[PDB]
Amino acid sequence: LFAGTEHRAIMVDSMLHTVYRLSRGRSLTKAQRDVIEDCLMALCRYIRPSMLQHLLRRLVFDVPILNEFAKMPLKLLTNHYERCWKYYCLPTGWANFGVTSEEELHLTRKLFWGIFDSLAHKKYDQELYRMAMPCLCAIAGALPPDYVDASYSSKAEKNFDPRPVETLNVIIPEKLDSFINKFAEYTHEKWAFDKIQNNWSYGENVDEELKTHPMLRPYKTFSEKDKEIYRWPIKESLKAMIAWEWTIEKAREGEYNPQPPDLSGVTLSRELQAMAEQLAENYHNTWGRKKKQELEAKGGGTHPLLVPYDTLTAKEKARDREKAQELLKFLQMNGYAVTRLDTSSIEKRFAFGFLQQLLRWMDISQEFIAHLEAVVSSGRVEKSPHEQEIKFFAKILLPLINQYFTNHCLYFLSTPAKVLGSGGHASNKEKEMITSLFCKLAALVRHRVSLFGTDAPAVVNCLHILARSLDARTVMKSGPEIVKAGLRSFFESASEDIEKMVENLRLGKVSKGVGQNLTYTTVALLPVLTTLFQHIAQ
């Protein structure tokens, strides 16, 4: 019955929050906790994807810790994304549920990356790897490969505690203080302008029901204290701003309504918008700081809304961003320039970073395998300290590779001339990176199938999928000599292995290297080479 709760989405969200909190509850038995978990899952199934956005934000907070309570949410999110994947992935989306607000997409990216990094750093736990065995694969399938987040920057930040740096030991410019004084005077003037737009004329008479604030008097009559009290938020905010390694400099060295409307029309660069976002986030962190200082007296029931300003919904941005924009414009025309990478949309794509991490892990695979054979030859080390890295690789990355590239094969093969997929076509860089990953994995598995053991079937299946995904024409025509040489090396290595194998069948060799070559060929190479040839012919 909860399916159509569009008119009461607020109560639905409150209910979801309460059930989530109760699940995260001390003094609850296992059966009780299971009941809460089942109820939450069932409600999530029938509830619309849009409504769950707030709970997804809260879960983006919690889950990356990968604590004991992180088990059930991994399942909740797996089922939710598997079911509602077209809502996020496809531009049209499901009918009657709509499409993502792009904030859910940003949250989904963050969830994927936080879980990925946390699980990589964690030591192997079979249960946890199994809970993430339904894996980030659902999240990745939901995410479009071409999704570009408006803000792609290191957060560099961590339940939640913001810790300001206090420069009060240094001096403050009295010229600055006077500048914010005149800015607050002019802001009073714009406040009067706003009341005039509201059509309510501030009045000498006092009256609560008009909401006309009697306070409005000649500026000279005011009491000296209220001036600096009302100032102190502005002073504190600007103070924090110059404190957080952001310089204010003079652009051009020294030596009766408001006629000009302060309009938003002015153009702003992506990085300047990022700096306004960071400044608004710092203003909101000093906000949340004084909030938390007030609230710590009661000590319990922390306000859920208190979260990073960029992470929370873009609606709240408008006000603080507008004040930051008007301020920066004001200080720019005056000349007090405020000064704190150019990443292309292609780099900002989710698939680009995912492939980057995969290639980095491939390099790590090369290095610790090399160390492994080096120790095997002499000075054997039984410990195997890369144990966690090997487990992450085998248990997580290969299934993720298989699922992601099986789902999104067309996006990589698509070209602007011919678009096999419903939406989007992969960039040449993404094509090169997938080709490089395939060649690297082939080299890695080469003559090491015994080393991989039970994971070798997974490796070969991933190789098949990658081969089907490759668009070799684009890479060979316009691609780096590195990638072209890697692919050529794959081909020549396959040829050499086959000639050595046919010789071993000639039996000139006595009958170890021969067994290694034969098993590697049969199990991995010849099937993968066959698949690649079939894909090329098709």
């Binding site: 005039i196 737009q197 509201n198 059509n199």
Partner: protein, 48 residues
């Protein structure tokens, strides 16, 4: 003009008058005559 304070609690009432004999059409804003006027030939059919 309400570029300032655009929202108006008041409800607008536009009145349309037609003289069938003279073929003349006129308008009123809130009981205030508007400048716009039209003249039509006989036998014309007009729908509100």
């Amino acid at each position: 003009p309400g570029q300032q304070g655009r929202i108006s609690h008041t409800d607008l009432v536009i009145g349309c008058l037609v003289d069938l004999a003279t073929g003349l059409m006129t308008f009123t804003a809130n009981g205030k005559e508007s400048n716009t006027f039209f003249q039509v030939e006989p036998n014309t059919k007009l729908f509100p």
